Structures are given as C-alpha cells and as structure tokens.
Structure 1
Amino acid sequence: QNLPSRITKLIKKSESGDFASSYQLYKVFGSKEYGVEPDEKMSDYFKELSAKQLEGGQLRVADIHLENYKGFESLIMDFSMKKNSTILVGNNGCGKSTILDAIQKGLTHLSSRLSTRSHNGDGIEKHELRKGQNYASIAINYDYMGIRFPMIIATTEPGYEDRAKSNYSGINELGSIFKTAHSINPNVSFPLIAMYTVERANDVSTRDIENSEEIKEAQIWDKFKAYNKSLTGKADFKLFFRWFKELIEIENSVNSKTLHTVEDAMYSFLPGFSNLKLQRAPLDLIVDKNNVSLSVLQLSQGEKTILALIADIARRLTLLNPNSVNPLDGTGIVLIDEIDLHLHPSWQQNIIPRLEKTFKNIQFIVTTHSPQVCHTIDSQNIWLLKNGQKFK
C-alpha cells in the first residue's frame, strides 16, 4: 500500500464530503493507481460511501463524437457545465437532429441501467450509415460530479471488425452507484432522461380517456415509472390526466401540494390561466382563458404543445424525485427537438429562459430554426451547422 500524500488528502476530502474523491479512491484500491494494488475484496468503504454521498450530482453530457453517422463524416461537439442550455441552429440538411437523436441512443442504454431491466435499447442501423462507409461510431462522455464516463456505440459491417467495438464501461458503473445508493436509502433522487421530438402535440386530448383507452389498468406510482416511455418523443397528457384525477380524488397537504406545484409550473408559463379543474361528467378537461370558461378539446396548438410538454416533464420530475421541498429542481437531460414548433413569435423569445427558470437544474439541448429563439441566448451557447461542419 504505497500511499502518497494525495491519497490521504483525498481521503480527508471524502470524509468532508466529495463524491469525486470517493469514486477515484474506489478505482485506486483494486488497481495500480499510485500503486497500492488490490487491498480490499470490493468497495470497502469507498464506493458505498460515494453512494451514501450521492446527492446533488447532475447527469450532464459533456462531449459527443459522431463518426460516419447519418450524413456526417466526423463531428466533435463540446458542451459546457456552467451553462445549462445548448441551442443548435441551422437548416434542413445540416444535421442537428442527427445530434439530438444521436445522443438519445446512448441515453437509451443509460436508461436501461439507471432504473429498468438491463438491455441494449438501440444501436447503429444500416439506414444510418452514410451510404458507402463500413465503420460508424457515436461516442458520448457523461459527466457526473466531475468524473468522465466513456461510451462507444460503434457498429461494424461484415468483413471490417478490426477497429470498431462497443464499450459500455462507464454506464455499467453510473447506474451501479445509483443502485447502491437506493440500497442505502429508498428516497434517493434519480436523474431524468427524456427526449421530446416533433410529435409532442400528437395524442393530446381527453377524447375517450374517461373510458376504455388502455389506461384503465392499475398503475404503480413508483420512482421507476417515470422512466417508462421517456425516449419516444411523445408527451403523455393522457397519463397526466390519470395522475391529475388520482391526486385530486385523494385531495377531497403532502398529497395536495404536488398538483399545486405542477400547475404553477404551467402558470409561470403561458399566461392568463388559473383554476384548472376536471369534468366528472363525460366532458373534457377545463382550463381558464382569462376567466370566462374553456375546455382542453378546444384550444390553440401552442397552448396544447406547451401544456403537454410541461405536464410530462413536471410529472416525471415529481415521480423521480422523492419527498423534497422543491421536486422540480431535479437533475438530468431533457432533449427538446424542434422547440420552435407552434409558438407565437413573442414566445420564441421567452420559451428557453422560462424553461431554465422554472426547471432550473436540467441541461436543455434544444434545436431550432427561428433566429428569435437565440434572441435571449449568448453567442457562446450557439452552434451553427453547415455541410456537416460546426461553427460558433
């Protein structure tokens, strides 16, 4: 056990509280880092101590690399930690969808370890190669508490299995730490993994959800539920209707404050609304339109899309985050594709600042076309694209 003074310094820092030192030492003991060599059988008091001191960490992507995916030949994107917002502006032909929907592939594999069954969700498909190459690769570097996590989703084509191979060596531990933390305590907060594609507005209506619509089955409202159907890109308002019914039925303070917080999440957004109630009789959900009357089946599609999006995000953050003062302060990644979809042009100047105002702990990697989306965004947050190339 050759112990440098750095080992003792990191040990003292870990006692004071720092996940980074704990995970670094858990790698050190059992390896050759500063010698030492395997001392304990496994995770003596280092990985378990990290799991105990697992709180407040943000699951944020830091570096992605595309190699012959979609129409590209090579791409090296660089996000940042101090800024919780990434906006990808370009045109149809210069792929920012091949950035968002290239990160969702790795996010599916992370979802299938974070809290679900361990299984490979998506891989690189033949309709994804650049019509003529044989090797493809997407690399993602998750950064939790300041420690990197490699990902290689590289595929192969027959006859060329020599330099491309998948390596899930970081997400095999990023989820294991969370499982250990959940073993330590049951009320730990897991991050949110979510993508929202162009199809957000699809299936947002109370058509027959008061009747046979496949939600009639009993529902288990645990922490693992919010991870189901998250990376399909469709906002679930029908399930929000089920949750809203259940919470108000129980309401008739801890069982009531959730709906108040979720509703105030929307009220801080698109204005003029208050006192949203249901219809026990076979009518539609009712919401105010500057205090006369209105229902949800009769709305504007900007209202509809914003309502569905924010309802889904708030409901998943409430499920994922256990009893806490502010359940909406959860961490994770929320991918919004085509954010400039059905919003009046005076909204595409406040949609992003309010998203990072109310839900102010989640990185938002969004894609847009209208320049007005960038009107409230610094120049360093913007990534222009042209002919498979990235400009500042």
Structure 2
Amino acid sequence: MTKQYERKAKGGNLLSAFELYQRNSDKAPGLGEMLVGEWFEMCRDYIQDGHVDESGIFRPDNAFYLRRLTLKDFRRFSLLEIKLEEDLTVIIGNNGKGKTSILYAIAKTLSWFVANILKEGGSGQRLSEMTDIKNDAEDRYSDVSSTFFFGKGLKSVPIRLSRSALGTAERRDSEVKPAKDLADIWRVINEVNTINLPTFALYNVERSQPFNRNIKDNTGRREERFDAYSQTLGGAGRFDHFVEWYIYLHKRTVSDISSSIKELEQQVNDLQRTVDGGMVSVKSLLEQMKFKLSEAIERNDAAVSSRVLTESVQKSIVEKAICSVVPSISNIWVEMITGSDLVKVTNDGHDVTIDQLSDGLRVFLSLVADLARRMVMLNPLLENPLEGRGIVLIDQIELHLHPKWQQEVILNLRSAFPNIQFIITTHSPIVLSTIEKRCIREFEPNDDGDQSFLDSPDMQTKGSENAQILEQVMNVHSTPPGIAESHWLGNFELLLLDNSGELDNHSQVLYDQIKAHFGIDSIELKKADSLIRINKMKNKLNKIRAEKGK
C-alpha cells in the first residue's frame, strides 16, 4: 500500500507523494530523516521546474490549464462540451448565445480553487437555483463539469458543480474533492516554503465603472500576497487595490528604500522627544504607532527577503507591463501634493490624471494593471513574474476600444503574459483577425441549445481581411441590406442586362444617382464604369461571333 504509492511517486505523480507526506510528516525525525525531505523536494520540483527556451520566455515543465468544460442543463445549454486550447480560446456568437454563461461557469469552478487556496477547508461560490437552472429542462438540476491539466503526473483534475431547483426528491451535490486536494497541496507547501501560485482572474462587463479617486478603503492589508486573491473572480478589476498598492510602492521607493527607512523612525524620535516632557497625556498616539513598527517588521520582511523580490523591481515590472500592453499610455508615475497623492500617466504626450482618462483607455488599464499586480505579487521567484501560470477569463476584450487599437490588444496581452491561458469572448472581426482558426469557438445563428460541441470556423482568420472575417465567420453582409442605396449596383446590372448593355433610359439615370451619391472617386462608381465598358463592348463580340457562325 505504501509500496504502490512509492512506485507511483517514482513513476511521476504529484498526488501520490501527498498522502505519503501527510502520513510521515506527523512523526519525529530519525524516522522522518530524509523521508519527508525527499517527498518535499520532489513535490517542490514538480511545482517549480521550468526552462528558458530559444525565445527567452520562462516555460514551466508542468503547465496548468483547463482542458474540457461540460454544461448539462445549465441556463440555455442542454448538454454542451467545449474543448479549450492551451494558450488562447475565443468564443464568438450572437447576443443570446450563452458565451458569457461559459465564463460564468468557469469562474464558479475557479472560485473553489481560490477559496481552498486561501483557507483550508474553504468553500467557493455556488450555482444559483433561480436563474442558472434551465427553465425548459425537466430534470430540475444543472451540473457544470470541468477537467484541469497539471502536467504529465496529473492528467485529469475533475470537478463538478451541481445545483438542483427547490422541490426535487434528490439533492444533487458537487464533487470538488480533486480541486480540494490540489489546492491543499499548493497551500500546505506554500505555508512552509515559498512557491509561485497561479493567477485566477475574471474580467466581466462590470469593469466598466467610473473612478472615484477619493477611495479610503481599508488601509494596511494591500501589501500581503493573499490579498491578491481578494475578489479576483468578482468580475471587475480591483483598480482600487492597484492604485493603493501603487501609492504604497511610490512612498516606499522614494522614502523607505532610497535613504533607508525614515518616516517611521522620525516619529519614533518624536515620541522619544515627547516621552519625558512632564505629564504624558499622549496615550492615543503612544500605541497606534508602536504597532506600525510591528507591521513594517512582519509584513515588509517577506517583500525585502529572499521569498519576494525587490520592491523597486516590482514597480519597474508593473510600469513596464502597463506601458507595454496599454496602447497610448507610455509612462505612469505618482505625484505627492500637499494633502494629496495622485497617479498620472503620459497619454499621447500629455500628462493626464487617471480620473480624467478616457473610458476606453482606463478600463483596459484597470485590466492590465490589476493582472500585472496579481502576477508580481503571486509569482515572486521569477525573473519575469508575468511568465507565471494561471487562468484569466476576459469578457469582451474589445470593450470601448477603437478598431485601430483592436488590431494589437490580444497580441500585446499574449506577448506580456505568455503562460496565461486567456479565455476571451469577443464580438469584433478585427480581434479575430489577430487570432488563429484553432483558437476560436463559434455559435451558428440557429443555435437553440442542443449542440454537444463548439467548433472552429472553416476559413483561417489569422491574416484574412476584416470584410472576409465578418462575412464568412460572423455571417454579416459587408454592405447593409436594409439600405436601398446599397443594392444600386445590382439594380444597375439588372436594368443594364434588360436592354442588352445599353444606357438608354433607366441605366443612365440610375448611373446618375450612383455618381451623385457615392462620388466621383468612389470605388462603387469604379466598378460601375468598368462594367459599363465591359458590357458595352460585349455586343461587339456578339456581332463578331454571329458573323463567324453564320
């Protein structure tokens, strides 16, 4: 029984060494000398092995991603099976096809991972029993089944999330035990030695929110590593946490690390000045600063010590990520005015404060900044913490973005975060023009929920024109059919072939409408002119062929 687990550990398995570690860790050394150590060393190798390839990107030996997602009686899906790619998966379809529901189900699945990492025996989010159940289904329960991949030793991590409507005879339940096991391995090896936890994030529609800038949310917690999991699957990027963390980094960079720690010891010396002035009478500030020293001792020791890298390097890395992914903003830095601490960026050469940034350049910075924050806080043992593993669920990456800026958004995101499995659900063809054919899942525009598969489009979308992607993949005309001014070339050809290619009474006046509408330099009039010449000299060929024949 022990021998089978040791043979499985020799053959390669993360879970097989875990119960061995749990059964030999509770006794004394001598009986545990090198016994616990070899399984700890092998487990930490299986988490932390990685190599630098020929392109310079750190690639882990045991990548973590989601393989398959199965939705049974979930919202509008009868029984839907989706196979997800390793690096990027795009789900496209009309308004009404459940492509936000897919991200919602994956986020509900990842909530168990996040909660069980954060607290031992924790509980993640659960499916609702009012809206997520299919109102047409007669089984009155819905289950969401996912499979996770964590290397060759861990081929499958199953998880099911079940929910039954009220009134059922049998209470259907979840089977989140393998997610519990994997997050237990990560948490109990992280509590004793530092590792690189993965990033789980969901960027839903509710990132499109105004900035308040008067935000005095609870000061003190926004520098601890497990704060990076705080409301990370909520749907909205925690730009509040990012800007509080960035003011923390600016103050610590300009004061705490340039000329050592000073802002605490100056008021320590103030207390040593005022401690023997007679009657003391200062008990309100006698103790509220004394634990600030304890805070800076037991929280900054991780960030300065060998587990978490240098804070100035953290600032440089998050600034580099922001100016690399975010299109026109090229630098981000903080001003300290009398009574205020405000962050300003260089947008198109103009120093613009965050609150008056544009709504299409601020809700993408709210994504990139928060994502880069969570990677640099959760993956500190890397030269580039943006190369850490994780799963990120972006909903409508093309939100509030110009078509000029949609041509590089997913290229910039995949360049900055190579090891993140992005799962995006876009509407625009221009985003699809930068994404491979195999990375696209699609919904046909007749999709009442019965499909057991989502398949890629037939034509390649990586270099195709936007009109071709719109008119072959998304099933939309290039010129609108609800406009009588768009069918004028077709009516021109009908009225011109009615009278054998002569501009007699109808084709000439309709040509005048085309010329007066589209313009002299218009490509539509260019086709019209070319077809006029080609079809006026066609009667010459008709006469020549008639003379040859008879």
TM-score (norm 1): 0.84
1:256 to partner: Cα distance: 0.9
Q: Report the count of equivalent residues.
A: 365
Give the aligned partner of residue 198 of structure 1.
205
Equivalent position SS for 2:433: helix
Classify 1:315/1:26 alpha carbon distance in 2 versus 1 (closer, same or farther; 3 Å): closer
Which has the higher relative contact order, 1 or 2, with Cα contacts under 8 A spaced 6 or more apart? 1
Task: Determine which of 117, 122, 126 is the counterpart of 1:122.
Answer: 126
1:110 corresponds to which letter in structure 2?
F
1:293 corresponds to which letter in structure 2?
D
Equivalent position SS for 2:311: coil
For 1:192 and 1:238, how far apart are their aligned partners in 2? 18
Q: What is the RMSD of the two structures over their aligned residues, measured on CA atoms?
A: 2.9
2:180 corresponds to which letter in structure 1?
N
Aligned pairs (5 A) from 1:12-91 = 20-24=12-16, 48-53=40-45, 54-55=47-48, 56=60, 57-81=62-86, 84-91=87-94
1:241 corresponds to which letter in structure 2?
V
Give the aligned partner of residue 239 of structure 1.
241
1:183 to partner: Cα distance: 3.9
For 1:308 and 1:26, how far apart are their aligned partners in 2? 38
Give the aligned partner of residue 36 of structure 1.
none
For 1:22 and 1:70, how far apart are their aligned partners in 2? 35
1:189 corresponds to which letter in structure 2?
N
Classify 1:292/1:131 alpha carbon distance in 2 versus 1 (closer, same or farther; 3 Å): closer
Give the aligned partner of residue 106 of structure 1.
109
Classify 1:250/1:159 alpha carbon distance in 2 versus 1 (closer, same or farther; 3 Å): closer
Larger Rg: 2
Aligned pairs (5 A) from 1:124-163 = 124-133=128-137, 134-146=140-152, 147=154, 148-157=156-165, 160-162=168-170
Equivalent position SS for 1:287: strand
1:138 corresponds to which letter in structure 2?
V
Give the aligned partner of residue 322 of structure 2.
266
TM-score (norm 2): 0.61
Q: Work out whether residues 330 and 345 of structure 2, in 8 Å CA contact, stay in contact via their aligned partners in 1.
A: yes
For 1:87 and 1:21, how far apart are their aligned partners in 2? 32
1:204 to partner: Cα distance: 3.1
Question: Is the helix fraction higher in 1 or 2?
Answer: 2
Give the aligned partner of residue 421 of structure 2.
363
Equivalent position SS for 2:163: coil
Classify 1:29/1:328 alpha carbon distance in 2 versus 1 (closer, same or farther; 3 Å): closer
1:229 corresponds to which letter in structure 2?
Q
1:285 to partner: Cα distance: 2.6
Q: Work out whether residues 348 and 372 of structure 1, in 8 Å CA contact, stay in contact via their aligned partners in 2.
A: yes
Give the aligned partner of residue 172 of structure 1.
180
1:391 to partner: Cα distance: 3.1
Give the stretch that moved more between structures: 148-157 or 284-293.
Answer: 284-293
Give the unaligned 5+ runs of structure 1.
14-19, 31-39
Q: Work out whether residues 74 and 143 of structure 2, in 8 Å CA contact, stay in contact via their aligned partners in 1.
A: yes
Classify 1:292/1:332 alpha carbon distance in 2 versus 1 (closer, same or farther; 3 Å): closer
Equivalent position SS for 2:422: strand
For 1:28 and 1:298, how far apart are their aligned partners in 2? 57
Q: Work out whether residues 23 and 50 of structure 1, in 8 Å CA contact, stay in contact via their aligned partners in 2.
A: no
Give the aligned partner of residue 285 of structure 2.
none
Q: Work out whether residues 22 and 47 of structure 1, in 8 Å CA contact, stay in contact via their aligned partners in 2.
A: no
For 2:165 and 2:345, how far apart are their aligned partners in 1? 54
For 2:180 and 2:370, how far apart are their aligned partners in 1? 28
Q: Work out whether residues 22 and 46 of structure 1, in 8 Å CA contact, stay in contact via their aligned partners in 2.
A: no
1:302 to partner: Cα distance: 1.6
Q: Percent identity among equivalent residues?
A: 28
Give the aligned partner of residue 475 of structure 2.
none
Give the unaligned 5+ runs of structure 2.
23-31, 49-59, 258-309, 457-550
1:124 to partner: Cα distance: 3.8
For 2:2 and 2:341, how far apart are their aligned partners in 1? 73
For 2:38 and 2:94, how far apart are their aligned partners in 1? 48
